[PDB]
Structures are given as C-alpha cells and as structure tokens.
Design a protein around this ligand. Structure first.
Ligand SMILES: CCCCCCCCCCCCO[C@H]1O[C@H](CO)[C@@H](O[C@H]2O[C@H](CO)[C@@H](O)[C@H](O)[C@H]2O)[C@H](O)[C@H]1O
Ligand SMILES: CC1(C)CCC(C)(C)c2cc(C(=O)/C=C/c3ccc(C(=O)O)cc3)ccc21
Length: 235
C-alpha cells in the first residue's frame, strides 16, 4: 500500500511532465485550410508531423520513468513502444478536445478545428477520432488516470515478439491495481469507471489500427517520406 501510493504518483508526474494539460497551454490558431475539407494541406501535415515526432520522444521519456520499464530488455522496450505509441498519441490528442469549439490542442498550443485535423492528415479517419474523443468526455478522467491508462496500454505482455512477456505482465499488474484504487477513491459513487477506462483501451486499439491504415494511404499523398520516428512507430 505505501509502494502502490508511490507508483500512482510516479506515473502521474511522469505523464504530466511529458504531456501538458489543456489548462496549462497558451492556445493559438492557424487560418490554413480552415473551412473546407481537402485531401491534404501540406503545411498542416508538416506541422502536425513535426508535433507528432516531438510527442513520440515525450512518450519514450514517459515510458522510461515507469517503474521497471528500463529493467526490460532494450529489445522489449522497443517492441512495447512500437506497439503502443500510436495508441498513446491518439489518446493524448483526444484528451485535448474542446467540445464547445470542436477543436484539438497540441503540446505547443496549436489548436486545430475538425476540418484542419482532417486536412493535416486524419482524412477519412477524422470523425471517428473525434467520436472517440467525444465518448471519453463522460469519463471525466484526470491526469493521473490518463497517465495510468497510458502506462497500462504500453506495458502489455501480449505484444508480438516480446522476449519476456511474463516479466511485462508482472510490471502491468501494479498499474492495474493502482488505477482501480485511484479511480474508486476519487469517485466512489461511480464504480463502473475503472472497467469503462479499461474498455477504452480496446476502442483505442481499434482506432490505432485504422490510423496505421490511414498512414499507408497518406504516404501516397505527401511528397516525401514520413519523419523517421513516425516510420519506426509504424513498422
Ligand atoms: C515506437 C516509436 C519509437 C521507438 C523507439 C525510438 C526511440 C527514440 C527516442 C530516443 C530519443 C533520443 O533522446 C535524445 O535525443 C532527443 C532528441 O534530440 C532528446 O530530446 C530532448 O529534446 C526534445 C526536443 O525535441 C524534448 O522534447 C525532450 O523532452 C528532450 O529530452 C533527449 O533528451 C536525448 O536523450
Ligand atoms: C501515423 C500518423 C503520422 C499518420 C496517420 C494519422 C493522421 C492517423 C496519425 C495520427 C496521430 C494521432 O492521432 C496523434 C497525434 C499527436 C501529435 C501530437 C501531439 C501533441 O502535440 O501532444 C499529440 C498527438 C499520430 C500519427 C499519425
């Protein structure tokens, strides 16, 4: 129980220090391709892809602050990150959804409307991502819960080509315990919150699978290769 309490705050702090809250950010806008959907606005793609690269690095930084992660083999660390990074990217942007404005906000404050998200590369996946974001709102998750959920998504023993899946399973166990404890303590009158959060991982996997599919078609729309850390994620 003291050890579990420390795990909660280690993960929470790792999340917050690699992922500013919507409240913390100085929002700004762009007038690029703001009012009609097009196949791709390359200026929006360039900026979005640069921001995704930076957030990938931040997810690696987050991962390495999770207790036990750096005790996994370097191969397993890489395997886990490649399997989960798109999921965590999508969860991250969807936690920065402002429903009143139908916008999402990136880590530098860039705030895009739905049409600009489409035009930045989401394309035919845009409305499904926004729907996921919409359906996260009734959970009213806080940063600690988002951080713990992200950690549970990453540290999972089912990933293909893991060398030591039992070791990964044992690292996941206390994260599950921590999220249940935290979530029930915070909102004891809503006991379905923990299982609803866990089921969002499945939903997330669905949309990340579609995101990988979208990456294949986007690759045909852009004039060069995707940034190298994005290619690492997608392989
Ligand atoms: C699954 C997708 C990827 C799979 C594994 C790929 C892992 C690659 C991540 C290692 C990145 C190398 O990390 C090394 O260079 C980074 C970029 O100059 C530095 O990154 C630094 O600058 C960034 C600015 O872009 C900041 O947001 C980081 O917080 C900061 O640490 C790191 O401080 C340094 O340790
Ligand atoms: C694979 C690739 C590049 C192309 C296919 C699509 C458009 C579906 C896609 C979507 C995402 C994503 O949802 C989330 C991106 C993201 C970028 C930056 C921030 C942040 O600044 O905090 C947080 C989140 C990330 C990557 C990609």
């Amino acid at each position: 129980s003291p050890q579990l309490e420390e795990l909660i705050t280690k993960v929470s702090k790792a999340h917050q220090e690699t992922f500013p809250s919507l409240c913390q950010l100085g929002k700004y806008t762009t007038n690029s391709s703001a009012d009609h959907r097009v196949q791709l606005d390359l200026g929006l793609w360039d900026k979005f892809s640069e921001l995704a690269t930076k957030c990938i690095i931040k997810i690696v930084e987050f991962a390495k602050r999770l207790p036990g992660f750096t005790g996994l083999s370097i191969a397993d660390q890489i395997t886990l990150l490649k399997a989960a990074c798109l999921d965590i990217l999508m969860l991250r942007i969807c936690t920065r959804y402002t429903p009143e404005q139908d916008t999402m906000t990136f880590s530098d404050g860039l705030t895009l409307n739905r049409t600009q998200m489409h035009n930045a590369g989401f394309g035919p996946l845009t409305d499904l991502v926004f729907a996921f974001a919409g359906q996260l709102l009734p959970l009213e998750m806080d940063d600690t819960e988002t951080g713990l959920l992200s950690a549970i998504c990453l540290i999972c023993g089912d990933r293909m080509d893991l060398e030591e899946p039992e070791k990964v399973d044992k690292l996941q166990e206390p994260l599950l315990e921590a999220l249940r404890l935290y979530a029930r303590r915070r909102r004891p009158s809503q006991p379905y919150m923990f299982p609803r959060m866990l089921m969002k991982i499945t939903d997330l996997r669905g949309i990340s699978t579609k995101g990988a599919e979208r990456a294949i078609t986007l690759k045909m729309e852009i004039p060069g290769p995707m940034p190298p850390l994005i290619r690492e994620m997608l392989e």
